């Protein structure tokens, strides 16, 4: 939860044929891990060249368009699959599950490296945007902003220096351009509150998520109300087996680091307009891992 010295705001990043499943039992916006690992992979390459530190990643979804068709038999929609190429044997290809969609998202990169002062901010922003364009986020190509209107450059602003008045003015200016989209944040307070509240009935976690993510109707008739948009998300992957040396795991793609079998862990996230958030640093997602316990979560602790 290190304080980011500066923040780079990507104005608009388009993605096509991304991963819309993100989980075995859920589908939709991609897992936050896909975005967090992206900034990490970028820092590993550009971080050494520009001598910058990126630990916080903010996610704001401006536009999400999936590829689904609702059938006439039932009200459950289906996804639009692709056609696999013919097999080597010459027989027809086998259909496989896949997802594709158009996702216009904006990422916030917290710059904690002190070396930023030694180089121009505009140059650092342009250098980062150049790698972001060639990079593939969420599993698909990133279509740059090219249209009749002028292109959108990446702006890096330092949040350490300046009075609180200038800080608030900057946050307002950023929210002004980030209003069209909705931000993504992890909300575990309400989740734990409901868990303890219904613990007496039964200690079931999945049941609570299922009950929260649905249209609840009360007898009176009436529909239960929620303060904002709440949806389940893949908080992380829990360790399912003990660590094994790179030699123990057969067919390992790397012998430098050991392989570990993990499972899926869900959570409950909330969609809040950027104007609702007071501190922008609280939006950036920070990956936290525990060496003893295999719990690895990207939830933003400073949000609470």
């Amino acid at each position: 939860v290190t304080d980011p010295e500066a923040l780079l705001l990507l104005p608009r990043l388009s993605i096509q044929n991304a991963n819309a499943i993100s989980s075995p039992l859920t589908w939709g916006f991609p897992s936050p891990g896909a975005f967090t690992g992206f900034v990490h992979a970028l820092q590993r390459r550009v971080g050494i060249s520009l001598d910058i530190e990126l630990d916080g990643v903010g996610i704001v979804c401006h536009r999400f368009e999936a590829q689904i068709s609702q059938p006439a038999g039932k009200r459950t929609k289906v996804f639009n699959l692709t056609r696999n190429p013919l097999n080597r044997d010459g027989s027809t290809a086998a259909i496989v599950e896949e997802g594709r969609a158009h996702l216009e998202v904006s990422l916030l990169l917290g710059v904690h490296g002190d070396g930023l002062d030694d180089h121009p901010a505009q140059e650092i922003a342009r250098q980062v945007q150049e790698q972001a364009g060639a990079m593939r986020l969420a599993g698909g190509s990133i279509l740059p902003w090219c249209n009749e209107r002028f292109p959108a450059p990446n702006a890096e602003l330092l949040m350490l220096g300046g009075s609180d008045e200038q800080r608030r003015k900057n946050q307002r200016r950023l929210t002004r351009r980030l209003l069209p989209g909705f931000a993504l944040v992890s909300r575990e307070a309400l989740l734990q509150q409901h868990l303890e509240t219904l613990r007496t009935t039964l200690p079931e976690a999945t049941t609570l998520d299922a009950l929260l993510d649905l249209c609840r109707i009360n007898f009176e008739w009436q529909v239960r109300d929620k303060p904002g948009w709440l949806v389940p998300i893949p908080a992380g992957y829990n360790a399912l087996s003990p660590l094994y040396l790179p030699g123990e795991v057969r067919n390992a793609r790397d012998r430098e680091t050991p392989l570990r079998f993990v499972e899926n862990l869900f959570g409950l996230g909330e969609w809040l307009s950027p104007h609702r958030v007071a501190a922008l640093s609280d939006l950036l997602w920070y990956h936290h891992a525990e060496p003893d316990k295999g719990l690895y979560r990207w939830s933003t602790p400073r949000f609470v």
Binding site: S23, T26, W27, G28, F29, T36, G37, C61, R63, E65, A66, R75, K77, V78, A94, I95, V96, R173, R176, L179, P180, F182, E188, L191, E204, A205, T206, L211, L214, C215, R216, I217, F219, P227, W229, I233, N238, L240, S241, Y244, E248, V249, R250, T257, P258, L259, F261, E263, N264, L265, F266, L268, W271, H275, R276, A289, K293, G294, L295, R297
Partner: protein, 314 residues
């Protein structure tokens, strides 16, 4: 064999080490996982740990340390458990009567929950039997849950220069705000006994109104190149100042000059009056405790609303 994870439903050529079961529950209480149940585990018979290319191995960063690759598997027990939990809810004579009661308006004791915008995923394709722990009916019958953001459904934006939408532009009624206004206006009939909880749901519902309102103006400015002179400018003058296009190349320099020294302050009054006329209140209740909290909430919301637009021109 009996295992809690298999690669058969994940991929046809996926082969690797399948764990027999979870000895411990690594899932923390702060989150939800398969390790939080520890019961109702259903493991079917399929048909030096090894991995495969389709294992979907992904590296994970560590603070000041090296990298650790993770090879997640396909949870079968949790998937079947959630599937049965949702099947017994959507189907069954018990839930069936519940939905019928809603149409009849009968206040039945039991409450039925719906799952709109569901998705279907097939396992095994032409050969569903190839999937592990997938029965004849269970194959391809596993439905997922929609995680799309509330803004997933996007419609067109229309702001014409005629009088058709010039007079009604100030309102800007949208299907998203229409469903919220009905829920907000339903909390004004609660008595003093229900005033305790109304202090939170009603307070949070005010912010969502301003949020859904600002999004409409943002999408309008981000979709329409501009708006020229339109009829009905008596009360619509304040609304036109919400979405400000750039000065035209062939226009004069007196357009931005007049708008620069003018702050948008009538938008707040037009919004407050619009909400006051949209939501009904009681005259006799003006001297009640509910009226005080209602006015306080409306004032708190109007303050942030006016503040948001104050920085727009400045």
């Amino acid at each position: 064999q009996l295992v809690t994870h298999t690669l058969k439903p994940i991929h046809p050529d996926a082969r690797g080490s399948n764990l027999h079961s979870l000895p411990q529950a690594p899932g923390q209480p702060g989150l939800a996982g398969s390790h939080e149940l520890g019961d109702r585990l259903v493991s079917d018979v399929v048909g030096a740990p090894a991995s495969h290319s389709l294992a979907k191995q992904l590296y994970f960063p560590l603070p000041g340390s090296g990298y650790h690759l993770l090879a997640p598997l396909f949870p079968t027990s949790l998937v079947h458990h959630v599937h049965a939990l949702l099947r017994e809810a959507r189907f069954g004579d018990a839930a069936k009567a519940a939905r019928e009661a809603r149409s009849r308006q009968e206040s039945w004791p039991h409450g039925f929950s719906e799952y709109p915008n569901l998705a279907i995923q097939k396992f095994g394709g032409t050969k569903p039997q190839n999937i592990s722990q997938l029965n004849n009916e269970r194959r391809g019958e596993n439905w997922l849950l929609p995680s799309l953001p509330p803004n997933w459904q996007r419609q067109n934006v229309n702001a014409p220069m005629r009088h058709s939408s010039v007079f009604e532009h100030d309102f800007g009624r949208t299907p998203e705000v229409s469903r919220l206004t009905r829920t907000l206006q339903r909390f004004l009939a609660k008595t003093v006994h229900n005033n305790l909880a109304i202090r939170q749901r009603r307070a949070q519902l005010v912010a969502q109104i301003c949020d859904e309102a600002l999004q409409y103006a943002a999408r309008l400015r981000e979709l329409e190149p501009g708006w020229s002179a339109t009829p009905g400018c008596q009360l619509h003058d304040a609304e036109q100042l919400w979405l400000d296009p750039l000065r035209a190349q062939t226009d004069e320099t007196f357009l931005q000059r007049r708008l620069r020294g003018d702050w948008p302050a009538e938008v707040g009054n037009r919004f407050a009056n619009w909400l006051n006329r949209a939501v009904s209140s009681d005259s006799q209740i003006l001297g009640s405790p509910e009226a005080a909290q209602w006015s306080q909430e409306l004032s708190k919301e109007l303050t942030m609303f006016k503040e948001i637009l104050e920085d727009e021109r400045d």
